[PDB]
Write a protein that binds this ligand. Structure first.
Ligand SMILES: O=P(O)(O)O[C@H]1[C@@H](OP(=O)(O)O)[C@H](OP(=O)(O)O)[C@H](O)[C@H](OP(=O)(O)O)[C@H]1OP(=O)(O)O
Ligand SMILES: Nc1ncnc2c1ncn2[C@@H]1O[C@H](COP(=O)(O)OP(=O)(O)OP(=O)(O)O)[C@@H](O)[C@H]1O
Ligand SMILES: [Mg+2]
Ligand SMILES: [Zn+2]
Length: 420
């Protein structure tokens, strides 16, 4: 009844850069929340890929996947034919992860086209709010023609929490050698804290142990969340309506000092309804109920355990996949006696586990003022949602780095334990 021009593909131009604020960032992507007008963007974030400042198929053409990654992920043509890295992460989540993890807490993204001018702006603008050692190691990849749009998981007063639970299980492989028996006793997360000190990457050993979080015991789950609150590092963040109010911003943070402790107790003023000196403890018993009560950590743990054999065994399958003289083996004859397809599934499955040990989850909480919980103490009812984030695809080449880091972790823990 009045001409509406047919559909078109959204393309953020240089104009539209002023509409997004720095939200955070990891070692790979740059997240920014929307501050403007359009309903196509109210309550959404945009995920832009950074590129390390140090760094192609056999015609010297930039390539989404090596041949081996091509072969390894071939059980899905959609996925191994992705022309750029955004559809690739978008099809990894839809075709590999969502079938494993269920679709209810996992939102594959939506691609938006973007100009090089857009990306060159957001970089210039945000580099103020980034931690300094993030800029000096990765800027915005100003070649991509796509970026990711997701729902913002700190909105719908609202208080959101972000957990990075990491690997919550002990290996039991035959391929773990006697000198490394400790790996069957101490969580890699625990043995990793030492080496991180020996590199001033944290200042205090973490209170947190992922064996508690994943124990499935609501009691030890509460220990974890209390341990997270205490020594947050890069495992625990809290935001009040979009803004951080505990934990690091694109980085980890030192112990929670009482000063922070009192700033957080009041930060919760009114959201939690309680008397001073008791709102922090309620907030922690409310996050523990939403964690436990969703059963979301359980299937998460099921994927992590696709790491059946530990890097000490999967490493050997990898030098098969890329046909190579196993450096490790010198003088298995077993793992190396496996049909190619079985070599492939171990390496494949190990990398899908690496995705699960590395994602985060975000529980979001709104006010009284269906899906919910009720603080046993303060007679309040909050509603919540839980979502995963950073289900990225780990590059195959990294099997060698996975191994070399594992080797160092236990090698360091061994000696620092024998020293006594
Ligand atoms: O231990 P390394 O290798 O440095 O890094 C870990 C991980 O690599 P991998 O675990 O998949 O090998 C990185 O993956 P990427 O983001 O590059 O895809 C990040 O998730 C990083 O987080 P960050 O510390 O930057 O926040 C992790 O460190 P964490 O141990 O502190 O969680
Ligand atoms: N959908 C979302 N809603 C709200 N915040 C988000 C969302 N996605 C990412 N973030 C924030 O941006 C930060 C970095 O994003 P993301 O994890 O996707 O990139 P990454 O570099 O792979 O990081 P990580 O290794 O921490 O998962 C996260 O720590 C998170 O707080
Ligand atoms: Mg990542
Ligand atoms: Zn070998």
């Amino acid at each position: 009844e009045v001409l509406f021009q047919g559909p078109m593909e959204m393309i953020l131009e240089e104009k539209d850069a002023s509409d997004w604020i720095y939200r955070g960032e990891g070692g790979a992507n740059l997240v920014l929340a929307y501050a403007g007008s359009s309903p196509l963007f109210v309550g959404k974030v945009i995920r832009i890929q950074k590129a390390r400042r140090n760094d192609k198929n056999s015609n010297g053409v930039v390539s989404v996947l090596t041949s081996d990654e091509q072969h390894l992920w071939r059980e899905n043509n959609e996925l191994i034919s992705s022309p750029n890295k955004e559809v690739l992460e978008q099809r990894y989540v839809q075709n590999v992860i969502i079938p494993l993890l269920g679709p209810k807490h996992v939102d594959a993204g939506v691609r938006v086209s973007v100009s090089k001018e857009f990306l060159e702006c957001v970089d210039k603008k945000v580099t103020k709010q980034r931690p300094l050692w993030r800029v000096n190691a990765a800027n915005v990849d100003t070649s991509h023609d796509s970026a990711l749009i997701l729902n913002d998981h700190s909105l719908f007063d609202c208080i959101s929490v972000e957990i990075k639970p990491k690997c919550g299980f002990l290996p039991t492989s035959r391929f773990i050698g006697k000198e490394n028996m400790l790996k069957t006793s101490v969580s890699r997360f625990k043995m990793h804290q030492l080496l991180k000190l020996e590199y001033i990457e944290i200042s205090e050993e973490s209170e947190y142990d992922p064996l508690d979080l994943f124990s499935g015991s609501k009691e030890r789950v509460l220990e974890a969340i209390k341990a997270l609150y205490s020594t947050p590092q890069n495992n625990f963040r809290v935001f009040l309506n979009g803004s951080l109010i505990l934990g690091g911003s694109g980085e980890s943070t030192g112990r929670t000092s009482p000063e922070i402790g009192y700033a957080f107790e009041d930060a919760l003023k009114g959201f939690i309804q309680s008397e001073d000196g008791h709102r922090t403890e309620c907030f922690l018993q409310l996050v523990s109920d939403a964690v436990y009560g969703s059963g979301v950590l359980d299937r998460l743990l099921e994927i992590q355990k696709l790491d059946k054999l530990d890097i000490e065994g999967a490493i050997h399958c990898y030098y098969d996949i890329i046909n190579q003289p196993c450096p490790i083996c010198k003088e298995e004859l077993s793992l190396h006696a496996l049909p190619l397809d079985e070599s492939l599934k171990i390496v494949k499955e190990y990398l899908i586990a690496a995705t699960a040990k590395d994602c985060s989850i975000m529980i979001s909480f709104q006010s009284n003022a269906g899906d919910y919980v009720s603080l046993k103490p303060t007679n309040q009812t909050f509603d919540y949602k839980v979502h995963f984030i950073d289900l990225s695809l780990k590059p195959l080449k990294r099997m060698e780095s996975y191994y070399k880091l594992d080797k160092k972790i236990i090698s360091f823990y061994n000696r620092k334990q024998k020293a006594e």
